[PDB]
Design an enzyme around this catalytic site. Sequence first.
Site, PDB file in Angstrom:
ATOM      1  N   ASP A 122     -19.972  19.481   7.681  1.00 28.34           N
ATOM      2  CA  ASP A 122     -21.424  19.449   7.682  1.00 28.34           C
ATOM      3  C   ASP A 122     -21.902  19.545   9.122  1.00 28.34           C
ATOM      4  OD1 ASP A 122     -20.234  18.208   5.428  1.00 28.34           O
ATOM      5  OD2 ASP A 122     -21.292  16.313   5.758  1.00 28.34           O
ATOM      6  N   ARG A 136      -6.453  16.389  -0.377  1.00 27.30           N
ATOM      7  CA  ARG A 136      -6.140  17.383   0.646  1.00 27.30           C
ATOM      8  C   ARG A 136      -4.680  17.270   1.054  1.00 27.30           C
ATOM      9  NH1 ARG A 136      -8.836  16.448   5.589  1.00 27.30           N
ATOM     10  NH2 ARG A 136     -10.757  16.262   4.330  1.00 27.30           N
ATOM     11  N   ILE A 183      -5.842  15.133  10.585  1.00 25.15           N
ATOM     12  CA  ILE A 183      -6.543  16.408  10.409  1.00 25.15           C
ATOM     13  C   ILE A 183      -7.616  16.164   9.349  1.00 25.15           C
ATOM     14  CG2 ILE A 183      -4.969  18.179  11.252  1.00 25.15           C
ATOM     15  CD1 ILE A 183      -3.653  18.192   8.476  1.00 25.15           C
ATOM     16  N   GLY A 184      -8.827  15.856   9.790  1.00 20.96           N
ATOM     17  CA  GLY A 184      -9.869  15.452   8.870  1.00 20.96           C
ATOM     18  C   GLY A 184     -11.112  16.322   8.901  1.00 20.96           C
ATOM     19  N   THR A 185     -12.211  15.774   8.407  1.00 25.29           N
ATOM     20  CA  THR A 185     -13.507  16.439   8.450  1.00 25.29           C
ATOM     21  C   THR A 185     -14.488  15.577   9.234  1.00 25.29           C
ATOM     22  OG1 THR A 185     -14.332  15.476   6.366  1.00 25.29           O
ATOM     23  CG2 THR A 185     -13.009  17.475   6.236  1.00 25.29           C
ATOM     24  N   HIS A 204       0.784  -1.224   0.000  1.00 26.64           N
ATOM     25  CA  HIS A 204       0.000   0.000   0.000  1.00 26.64           C
ATOM     26  C   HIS A 204       0.819   1.278   0.000  1.00 26.64           C
ATOM     27  CE1 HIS A 204      -2.138  -3.242   2.249  1.00 26.64           C
ATOM     28  NE2 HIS A 204      -3.000  -3.013   1.276  1.00 26.64           N
ATOM     29  N   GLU A 223     -17.231  10.986  12.574  1.00 21.34           N
ATOM     30  CA  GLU A 223     -16.319  10.763  11.452  1.00 21.34           C
ATOM     31  C   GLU A 223     -16.142   9.247  11.352  1.00 21.34           C
ATOM     32  OE1 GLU A 223     -12.503  10.000  12.230  1.00 21.34           O
ATOM     33  OE2 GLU A 223     -13.967   9.194  13.664  1.00 21.34           O
TER      34      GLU A 223
END
Lengths: 224, 233, 233, 233, 233, 233
Positions: free
Chosen positions: A204, A24, A88-90, A4, A179
């Site tokens: 959101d 990103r 570091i996400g959403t 991977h 998440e």
Amino acid sequence: MTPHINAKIGDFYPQCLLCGDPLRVSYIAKKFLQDAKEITNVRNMLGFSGKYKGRGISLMGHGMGIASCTIYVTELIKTYQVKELLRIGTCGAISPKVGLKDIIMATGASTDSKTNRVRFLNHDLSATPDFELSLRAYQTAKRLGIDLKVGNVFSSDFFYSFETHAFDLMAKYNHLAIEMEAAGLYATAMELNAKALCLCSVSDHLITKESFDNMIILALEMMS
Amino acid sequence: MTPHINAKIGDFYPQCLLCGDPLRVSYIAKKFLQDAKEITNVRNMLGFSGKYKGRGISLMGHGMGIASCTIYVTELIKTYQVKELLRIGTCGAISPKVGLKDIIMATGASTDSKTNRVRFLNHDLSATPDFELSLRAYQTAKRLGIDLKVGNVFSSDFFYSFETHAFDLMAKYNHLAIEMEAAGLYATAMELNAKALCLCSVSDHLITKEALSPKERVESFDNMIILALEMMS
Amino acid sequence: MTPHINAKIGDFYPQCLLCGDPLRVSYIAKKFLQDAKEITNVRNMLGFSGKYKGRGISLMGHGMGIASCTIYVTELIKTYQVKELLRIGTCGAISPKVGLKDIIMATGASTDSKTNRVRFLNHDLSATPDFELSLRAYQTAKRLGIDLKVGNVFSSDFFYSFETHAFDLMAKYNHLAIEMEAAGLYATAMELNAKALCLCSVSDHLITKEALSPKERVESFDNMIILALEMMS
Amino acid sequence: MTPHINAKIGDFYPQCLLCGDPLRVSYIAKKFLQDAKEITNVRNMLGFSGKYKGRGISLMGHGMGIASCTIYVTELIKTYQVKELLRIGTCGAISPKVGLKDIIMATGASTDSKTNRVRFLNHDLSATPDFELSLRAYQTAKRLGIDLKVGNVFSSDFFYSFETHAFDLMAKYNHLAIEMEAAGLYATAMELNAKALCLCSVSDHLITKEALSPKERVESFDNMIILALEMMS
Amino acid sequence: MTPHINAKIGDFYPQCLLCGDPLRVSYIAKKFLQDAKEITNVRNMLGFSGKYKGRGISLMGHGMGIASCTIYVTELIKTYQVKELLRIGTCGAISPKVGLKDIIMATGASTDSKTNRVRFLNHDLSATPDFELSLRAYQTAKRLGIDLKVGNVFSSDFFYSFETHAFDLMAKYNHLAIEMEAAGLYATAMELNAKALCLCSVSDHLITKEALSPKERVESFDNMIILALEMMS
Amino acid sequence: MTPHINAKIGDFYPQCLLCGDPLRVSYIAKKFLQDAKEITNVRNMLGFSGKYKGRGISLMGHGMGIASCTIYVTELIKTYQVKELLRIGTCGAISPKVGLKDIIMATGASTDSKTNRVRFLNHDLSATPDFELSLRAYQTAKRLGIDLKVGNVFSSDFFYSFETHAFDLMAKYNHLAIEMEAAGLYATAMELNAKALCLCSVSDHLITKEALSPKERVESFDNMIILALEMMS
Ligand SMILES: Nc1ncnc2c([C@@H]3O[C@H](CO)[C@@H](O)[C@H]3O)n[nH]c12
Ligand SMILES: Nc1ncnc2c([C@@H]3O[C@H](CO)[C@@H](O)[C@H]3O)n[nH]c12
Ligand SMILES: Nc1ncnc2c([C@@H]3O[C@H](CO)[C@@H](O)[C@H]3O)n[nH]c12
Ligand SMILES: Nc1ncnc2c([C@@H]3O[C@H](CO)[C@@H](O)[C@H]3O)n[nH]c12
Ligand SMILES: Nc1ncnc2c([C@@H]3O[C@H](CO)[C@@H](O)[C@H]3O)n[nH]c12
Ligand SMILES: Nc1ncnc2c([C@@H]3O[C@H](CO)[C@@H](O)[C@H]3O)n[nH]c12
């Protein structure tokens, strides 16, 4: 190497930022790093190494879901010797305590996955970040003037939930957003004696129905 | 549109091949489809629409793991009106009856995920493919001369298992290989009244111990790719 | 005037120190709290109110086990309007990174209890303390020179475990010690929007079997008591 | 010679039809077999051997419920060398896609039993039939002009369900009917490397409320019987 | 000697009455025992030895909840050589078959705890008392003229339940009342080959919402205390 | 009148003896019952009505396993108004407290089934008999000179166990033997407010591997049969 990641051993710096979206990752590399270099690209999942204020930092994408994130974090730690992992996400907010673009620090990551029961004797693993990293984030946010929201997240196997009627109860129990990776990031770093922390920016708001550069600068500054 | 696909409605043909690796999706597009057109690329997860021997077919990447696969399959069915979904992936063999590059048709997908218990009343959902698609795979493979191994796969949340001691037990119960998406593809298509099948080519053998390069995972499986394209013609 | 507390509303200050042993609660009141007054005594489970460096502080015993802890904490919050709950106790070390007399700050509390699955949709509730309280503990410990160990604890329903073979795996996953309440305190405080934190002193090492003599047990713990009172004033 | 079968080793042909009701087993032997012979009768659970169109075939009852089925199937495989086991039972429809007396081929058998979690690592075992038998049944049904429905069934420990509010979710996930043995038949034959398949005729319609009589559940399903005998020839 | 009991070995009689509240233990010692010595007091959890109408017996407090009760019972059996444990206490009625002041003998104790699944192979342990003790309770109550209700209780980890909607279902299945320890007591006595029985008196009705007065809670349970003491004679 | 019982309403007496083997049921009617009359025979599962010492008594076969036993017990209570269910049968001993020919009275029935979790909120249901019936058995056995063994049994879904390594732990927790129905009979009787008791005779010892001969099996079982018939008088 691995199935991977096709970076050379040693291409990764010991501090690495993580996002699920490899684009990103590419955006950060181009906009915020000096002398950035793509170091892996298996499955279009990009990773980079570069410099921020003269100090080496790596970036790596981990895809979506606990199973995907676990693959990449396991390899980063075991093969590429990464020591500090900062996701570091959403996320989708479910609490009235947070709004769009707020940055959440996940001091615990609940889950509907079975992965931690498999890891942990069929009991309840409280999946948590490294405390020094959480303290570092708080202090770094303070000097940047960023208002850090702090609480639990719920890491789900489902983006399209079958239990939306339970979002209120999650929020009642201090889950600020949903998440899909933190519980896996946290459990893997616990398994392998590494330092991990999840920050997510609210993209959101699932209750009220309602450019994460500030989170990116926060992450880079806490790795300085 | 959807958060994870930026194609417009009507871009997908109602028959769709699926891979976890969007580069395999990219490789199949350039090599086997005429007038291939990239129709989505959110998160670098590529999808394509094109024709194969005059008949239109779509391709779509779904990432690794049940959670990732479920997002894309849900969106393909509910928003893009895809009707037939044929996963052509890789897997790790745990049975002596199979070797590297063997093709496996998964007539059942067991799992260590909790996802199907969440979907299905905390009971055991037997995750299965659409029988008509499986019959087509069997017949098409027979016609093409392809030797199709048929059995269960085990869909795991773990690429790096904590239960390698259980591999012989799995194989005793007719699990030919391990991958990480079939149980989710099957349950999602069951939920949403769509037709799905999983074919996987052996890229690792977890008992006789071998492994294929990341390049080889795209290149050494043209047999399975052609079988899928023929099934949809 | 709950079934388990016979104080009047307003007898408890909004910050409360918690211990399982009501005699330790009494010790703290007699040694540390100015104007210490007993305010509850149902079931011999004593609670007190007094002042420490001019700030009102209450103390309450909670007994042993998640179910006992949960009764008292629920009543303290919902009836007596307690908002910050700081638990100090003992624990048995299972990790080579902690030793006898260490003070542990539990940033998470795993459990073999079913209580949090009952509370939380049969999923995994990550039981955690209030971050600002943990911040205060770290800052105050540094100020007082205490070398605070920080990690998970495992809150068990069993004092005499049937799974001692699992202690090494718990220690691998950053569980420093075992006690029997923290998962319950943390989940009850999460349910009811209160701020809680657990500190525990290592009285016994479950792996090597070393153990404090009674005099050592009170030699330490005084430091943990001072830490708790200092971070609350 | 087992506790549950008093046949002699060598009395069973390698191909065996199975019903839960031994009086249906009796009905088949008397009506469809030449030279039929009663070979076992422990607990009134009858079994027979004879010829259908010159070819040997066995018939055996398995009682009601996974635990009963598993006993008889385990013994048929391990003691009496049965290789192919075809269940021809009854079921209660929960899906509008079928009606009374329809024949259903179970390509998977979901369950509310714990038996497969006990067998299989506390994970989700997708209990499935042998694909070649399932292919045989589809081709023979077509060859005989018999309309065959194909989907999952749900094998329950309950004839009188406590979860009737869940039937629409089951039907949504492609479960056409409820019966009580297929999951155990499938998992036992996976365990023991045998070929199994389940066909069931709809005897109750759980959404409109029809129920055939006990007499009718033995005599009204000749098409299912002829289908089974034909695919064993 | 044990962490939670500071009696000398030999201080307890082989028959021991148990109650969660150490002040109720003290009440029993004062009103019913002669020549009574308090033999243990760790954590204010009192235990006594003395004579009931000339016959030596012991009393011991056990606190609230299965985990607390399990600690004390395990130590009584393994260290202090207790052989018969009779537990009394209060409960919340959920059935129309019992009312305030009724005495219930628990011939089984269901639970929402995970402790017996941890103890017992993750299966269902039916936690039950010793039969000879139940028969001796039945004959003693008949002789004393005390009406004894008999059925199951539900031992909960929650005094403040999150499943009040389920009380009717528990009552349907012959659960007369809810308390918090019996399932742990019974499982512990079963583990350790000791005889145990639980009696409880309805102090509150969780359905009709009736409750005993403060005076009644002090004075109404003497008949249950007398039944217990008499069956130890 | 039910899919599994073709008796006319009123054919059953309100006291019914149960046994899994319908030929053992016939044997009881044929040897012990005055004016014995067959009242049902669906699926070769016989039941009878008749008199013993002048009192009316019914017999009914219930097959093997919890699911099968639950079907028949539910129908007897709900359709045929049976009030008292006395189940006899055989069992496999696992405890050194019992040996061949011993009669066990099951005051609790543990299980590896999921049925009681499905019935009982996913919690632990303690499956127990009616206490009055247990006393009747003890008192009748006394009058008859029978050394009745009393304890728990383990009702398994597996005759051929996958967990034989766990038998010693079961016996440790007072499980005297293994059978396959009692937890279901008990739960069904609790659900439906009926009185039930399970007696079983040790025909085999799973630890010592002793077994009763095909002949001496039948003389040991008449004792248990007469115990049962004398209780119903
Ligand atoms: N309701 C939700 N809303 C916004 N973002 C997410 C996410 C996060 O974003 C990705 C899904 O788009 C996934 O990796 C997860 O971390 N999960 N659930 C979400
Ligand atoms: N030994 C193996 N184990 C688990 N999954 C896979 C796979 C598949 O390949 C990806 C993981 O590398 C993912 O798509 C999974 O389904 N190939 N080989 C595998
Ligand atoms: N091995 C162990 N060693 C020392 N203390 C504890 C404790 C704590 O001490 C009490 C049990 O003695 C209980 O309240 C719990 O918080 N649990 N397990 C322990
Ligand atoms: N509505 C229904 N529900 C559950 N099982 C069955 C059956 C089958 O018939 C028997 C129960 O009547 C048993 O063999 C079971 O598999 N027929 N109709 C059924
Ligand atoms: N609703 C209820 N009502 C009365 N007593 C109890 C109890 C018993 O009383 C104690 C709680 O007050 C507990 O230890 C148990 O023995 N639990 N729940 C109860
Ligand atoms: N190891 C075992 N040994 C003897 N009898 C049984 C039984 C009982 O006998 C039947 C199995 O033949 C079953 O219905 C149950 O009542 N189960 N398991 C057994």
